[PDB]
Structure 1
Amino acid sequence: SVTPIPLPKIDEPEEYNTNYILFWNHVGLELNRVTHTVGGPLTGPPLSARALGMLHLAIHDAYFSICPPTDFTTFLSPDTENAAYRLPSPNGANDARQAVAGAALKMLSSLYMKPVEQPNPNPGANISDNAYAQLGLVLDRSVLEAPGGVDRESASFMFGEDVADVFFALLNDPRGASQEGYNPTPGRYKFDDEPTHPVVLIPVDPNNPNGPKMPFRQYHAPFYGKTTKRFATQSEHFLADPPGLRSNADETAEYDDAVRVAIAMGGAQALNSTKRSPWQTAQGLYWAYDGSNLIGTPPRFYNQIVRRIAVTYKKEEDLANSEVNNADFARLFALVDVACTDAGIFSWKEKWEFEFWRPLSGVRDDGRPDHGDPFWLTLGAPATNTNDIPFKPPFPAYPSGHATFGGAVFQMVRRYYNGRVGTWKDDEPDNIAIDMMISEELNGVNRDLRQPYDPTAPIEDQPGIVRTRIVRHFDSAWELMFENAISRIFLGVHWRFDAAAARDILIPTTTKDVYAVDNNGATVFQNVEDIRYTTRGTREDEEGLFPIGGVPLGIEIADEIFNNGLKPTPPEIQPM
């Protein structure tokens, strides 16, 4: 019925998918990239993370229900009185492979299928039937490629689907990304539609693309972080007021230097004012994954990296028949993906709370003849595998979602591997190194097209400029976390403070809030080995010191989840 979209090859050993836990993570990642290529459900950063958090939670409890863990316990218990939180019981079901399969297939089906359950109005109603059909191909195919096969008649398989139903019913946020009712309030430091993509024309009817179109101003998930059910966090998380706002409105020198730096480090390639280096351009594009065709969102890359870390540091050589390895991955991916989910909730909550402007607009609309540049252009979020120009993600700047996701994800890996891969203090540089890590943004295959993307053809048969293939080696998760955060500065899409306190990542000078520059005028960063996310700030509405930027927020979120052992967010503290 549909022409299957030809997906490019993934840079990763085929041996990885011989382990059924990695297999299902993989299918989750394939659905992630395909929904961003066809415009289906669970698009965007916060919600694409949630989909992975829900998949792994279900896989987690189904597996540990059949092979009970020694230290921790299942996220939900079978003995809980509260129905919503009551885990189904196996009752003789004892096939862990089939329970995971049923749980992964059910969750992924429930998440990505055409909502025939009637309740689909306005939730995400703008998805064509092709989008749905393309995602169905991925689902059907996955049943066929699953290592060990899939037995739908199996009691263990049925038990798994039962597990998924509970998690879906409890944690699904059908209308989470609703933009309905939100409109920007222009003014200094205020988020508004970005000048290079002020409005978009979208077909009136998704199932009628070449028919009429209508103007559209997109605001990504403005009510989500403030209303959605948290996963495993045990408290609300907050950041300090960004420079220029509220209690930090007097941080004039900090703000102004942030403008200077923004221009020199994140401008477009050919601008005279751009002092960023070719290598720094690489670090910026490496971590993008900005909802592009055949690429998806950041959570997809974070997982690609985590899969690599898991195989490199596994306890047993056998990827196919090792319960030790199965247990390790089910636990790790649940921890990392639940942390990613919550990182997404809180970074989005803060974004829309402060509604801080993007550097493109903060620079153009500065208003001061000697400080602003009313015609500046950023390197921008790359629109890979399209023929479109770079863009500014459709949501406020503070804090950076990438920085939060990275802080959460990599702080989780560190807490998990400390003592296994090396030894270090909780908040100090780790030993978790990896090599041969390739980003899909720079793999010698993906490209910037010269004509609109053709979904019926392989990317290699489509004219455009190919992204240089860069194979990377990283010394630690600290470096991964750090580079992922500063990547948004090189792209010009985030202010330094959206990442972390300037004081924690930049080299100071004798002038306050003004950091070091080299001869060509480029910003000098602290060595990764020396970076400590310790600089806090104040809030107008709350007492005390709070972290600055996304990195500390994510770290804080991962520590809390881990220290509590992956346990539900108490309902008493859920948004109401």
Structure 2
Amino acid sequence: VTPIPLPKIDEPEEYNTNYILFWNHVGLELNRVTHTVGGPLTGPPLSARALGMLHLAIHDAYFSICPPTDFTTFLSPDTENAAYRLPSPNGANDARQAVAGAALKMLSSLYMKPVEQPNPNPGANISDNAYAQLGLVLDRSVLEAPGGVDRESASFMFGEDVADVFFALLNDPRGASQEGYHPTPGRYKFDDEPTHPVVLIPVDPNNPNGPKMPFRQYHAPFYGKTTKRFATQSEHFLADPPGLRSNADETAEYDDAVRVAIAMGGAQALNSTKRSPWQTAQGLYWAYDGSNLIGTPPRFYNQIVRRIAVTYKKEEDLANSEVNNADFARLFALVDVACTDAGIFSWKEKWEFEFWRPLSGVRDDGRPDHGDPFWLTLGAPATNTNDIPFKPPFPAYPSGHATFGGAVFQMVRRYYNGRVGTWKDDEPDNIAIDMMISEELNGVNRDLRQPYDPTAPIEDQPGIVRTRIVRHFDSAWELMFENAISRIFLGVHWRFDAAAARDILIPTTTKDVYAVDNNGATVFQNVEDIRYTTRGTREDEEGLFPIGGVPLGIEIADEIFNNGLKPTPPEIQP
């Protein structure tokens, strides 16, 4: 089978000499490959779940062999419930091999063609080529693993046993099913986006050349409400979005959000677009909208965390240092589990409210002086394809990017506080990173002029190459903020999808109306001054709740961290 030529990753080759980072890398490679071939575990929420499961398995295998002192394994060897019972080592003491067995078994269980009968519905739409391409990745990873892989060792066998428990417990086979779901048209309501109202896909994935059939995608409408949570200790809720329920009277906020959406998120050439060239770059930088050779946001978030992990490591040797191994195993488990639960709660709230995307909101507004029936957004980029930009197939409120980012970066901030600097947990840190390149703007990936060719390196395919932009950031607080506002620049999210407008924008004397500069561009608050303090009401619940994705992710990370990475009590699972 012709292996797909993958473009080079911008990262020091030394990172992969550490076996914890190496297995994270294999996970990221499978993420970008399934999104290129249309294999299993695609989309933002399930792709995050895959990495959370990989890192829990790695975490409990490693720490069972090299017992920690500050915390314990996620699961326990002494639990009464067989489902949450961790296997015992019994003499196995090679952590490298135990981690290899756990990582390999988990990734194989997740990406293998379902031989266990359960294929219909759950994955009855994935070609054999997809499975074969992912298999090649798994096969060569065995040969590239630092220190090699000994499948015959007891430690390796133990790790496999560890992955089995986690796989049985947390795998959600029908997680992304949409069967039975249909939008309900109306003001503020999500429906198929007007530039991609229907797509034509093969009737048989094994014959991608016709016949095709009409398909309308609704991404994981039942997941958030039915799936098992990983480590959260309660259910998380957001305030009703402007225009709906208890906040249906918040019309000045809504109308101004419509204004900001047009100015900041329109197509490049529209006379109404006020976004600057730099802001367009900040918008594309954080995309990772499930594109060919790129994958989803959790992939990028891990790429950033690898850099942070290595930049702030306690010891200089990446290959043979149990201190570095332990630090990385713990960090990635915390970050990826937080990313998984953020995906769950952002999806639960997305489909609870079914709030429409800005493209439809602006076009269908209905008022002659507020909407633009012909507006076009910069959009989510269809990188490495000759397709046009699109609107992700799921509700707007809250933003998945914003929630993932709040969780991932608040976790990094809780983990490194007192080690890299000192700050109050709800205030800006000093976790700086440099030489950070996004694959959306690396001087290699591009917008093609003809269909993508999976047998040729991307460099040999005609298109407009994305400018290479090397960035430096001063804090994880900045990372969290830019990640969220990037979606406003693409025009795929409303301001309140990221956070309360009051917390991120500059106020004017007019309530709910914010500042714009000379060229009518929105002015944001300096990162150092931002505090996510504005909360709102819910019609069905008493109390004040966070507004938008960032504050939601932040609360998810704090809860998990504060409870020391402990399973969600079986009592409160759906």
Partner of 2:558: 559
Give 1:284-363 correspondences, 5 Å limit.
284-363=283-362
Q: Deviations over 1:472-511 (max 9, x none)?
A: 0000000000000000000000000000000000000000
CA distance in 1 between counterparts of 2:441 and 2:316 reads 30
Partner of 1:164: 163
Partner of 2:515: 516
How many residue pairs match? The answer is: 574
How far off is 1:570 after superposition? 0.2
Q: Secondary structure at the match of 2:439?
A: coil
CA distance in 2 between counterparts of 1:386 and 1:39 reads 14
Partner of 1:144: 143
Q: Deviations over 1:202-261 (max 9, x none)?
A: 010111111311000000000000000000000000000000000000000000000000
CA distance in 2 between counterparts of 1:414 and 1:554 reads 13
CA distance in 2 between counterparts of 1:437 and 1:519 reads 31
Q: Secondary structure at the match of 1:209?
A: coil
Q: Deviations over 1:112-137 (max 9, x none)?
A: 00001001110121100000000000
Asked if 1:433 corresponds to 2:432, the answer is: yes
CA distance in 2 between counterparts of 1:272 and 1:420 reads 49
Q: Secondary structure at the match of 1:441?
A: helix
CA distance in 2 between counterparts of 1:245 and 1:125 reads 37
CA distance in 2 between counterparts of 1:211 and 1:195 reads 24
CA distance in 1 between counterparts of 2:384 and 2:125 reads 22
How far off is 1:293 after superposition? 0.2
Q: Deviations over 1:342-379 (max 9, x none)?
A: 00000000000000000000000000000000000000
Give 1:95-494 correspondences, 5 Å limit.
95-494=94-493
Q: Deviations over 1:152-197 (max 9, x none)?
A: 0000000000000000000000000001100000000000000000
Q: Secondary structure at the match of 2:210?
A: strand
Q: Secondary structure at the match of 1:241?
A: coil
CA distance in 2 between counterparts of 1:179 and 1:27 reads 29
CA distance in 2 between counterparts of 1:285 and 1:124 reads 31
Q: Secondary structure at the match of 1:435?
A: strand
CA distance in 2 between counterparts of 1:485 and 1:529 reads 15
| 202-211 vs 429-438, which moves further | 202-211
Q: Deviations over 1:16-68 (max 9, x none)?
A: 00000000000000000000000000000000000000000000000000000
Report the TM-score when normalising by structure 2: 1.00
CA distance in 2 between counterparts of 1:38 and 1:12 reads 24
Q: Secondary structure at the match of 2:163?
A: helix
CA distance in 1 between counterparts of 2:420 and 2:300 reads 22
Q: Secondary structure at the match of 1:373?
A: coil
Asked if 1:502 corresponds to 2:469, the answer is: no
CA distance in 2 between counterparts of 1:406 and 1:557 reads 11
CA distance in 1 between counterparts of 2:119 and 2:503 reads 45
CA distance in 2 between counterparts of 1:93 and 1:211 reads 53
CA distance in 2 between counterparts of 1:38 and 1:470 reads 27
**Which runs of at least 4 in structure 1 moved beyond 6 Å after TM superposition?**
none
CA distance in 1 between counterparts of 2:516 and 2:143 reads 56
Q: Secondary structure at the match of 1:465?
A: strand
| 217-226 vs 201-210, which moves further | 201-210
Q: Secondary structure at the match of 1:376?
A: coil
CA distance in 1 between counterparts of 2:386 and 2:545 reads 42
Q: Deviations over 1:60-101 (max 9, x none)?
A: 000000000000000000000100000000000000000000
Q: Secondary structure at the match of 1:473?
A: strand
CA distance in 1 between counterparts of 2:547 and 2:119 reads 38
Q: Secondary structure at the match of 1:107?
A: helix
Q: Secondary structure at the match of 1:379?
A: coil
Report the TM-score when normalising by structure 1: 1.00
CA distance in 1 between counterparts of 2:502 and 2:108 reads 46
CA distance in 1 between counterparts of 2:255 and 2:71 reads 49
Segments of 5+ residues of structure 2 without an aligned counterpart are none
Q: Deviations over 1:419-464 (max 9, x none)?
A: 0000000000001000000000000000000000000000000000
Q: Secondary structure at the match of 2:441?
A: coil
| 123-132 vs 481-490, which moves further | 123-132
CA distance in 2 between counterparts of 1:443 and 1:221 reads 31
Partner of 1:55: 54
Q: Deviations over 1:513-544 (max 9, x none)?
A: 00000010000000000000000000000001
CA distance in 2 between counterparts of 1:544 and 1:325 reads 43
How far off is 1:262 after superposition? 0.2
Segments of 5+ residues of structure 1 without an aligned counterpart are none
CA distance in 2 between counterparts of 1:348 and 1:125 reads 23
CA distance in 2 between counterparts of 1:326 and 1:126 reads 39
| 208-217 vs 13-22, which moves further | 208-217
How far off is 1:310 after superposition? 0.2
CA distance in 1 between counterparts of 2:49 and 2:527 reads 30
CA distance in 2 between counterparts of 1:57 and 1:431 reads 28
CA distance in 1 between counterparts of 2:513 and 2:373 reads 23
Q: Secondary structure at the match of 1:436?
A: strand
What is the RMSD of the two structures over their aligned residues, measured on CA atoms? Answer: 0.3
Q: Secondary structure at the match of 1:124?
A: coil
Partner of 1:71: 70
CA distance in 2 between counterparts of 1:26 and 1:216 reads 33
CA distance in 2 between counterparts of 1:530 and 1:314 reads 29
Q: Deviations over 1:319-361 (max 9, x none)?
A: 0000000000000000000000000000000000000000000
CA distance in 2 between counterparts of 1:121 and 1:499 reads 37
Q: Secondary structure at the match of 1:455?
A: coil
Q: Deviations over 1:131-158 (max 9, x none)?
A: 0000000000000000000000000000
Q: Secondary structure at the match of 2:471?
A: strand
CA distance in 2 between counterparts of 1:208 and 1:391 reads 25
CA distance in 1 between counterparts of 2:119 and 2:164 reads 18
CA distance in 2 between counterparts of 1:108 and 1:213 reads 31
CA distance in 2 between counterparts of 1:229 and 1:138 reads 28
Partner of 1:42: 41
Q: Deviations over 1:251-283 (max 9, x none)?
A: 000000000000000000000000000000000
CA distance in 2 between counterparts of 1:82 and 1:511 reads 58
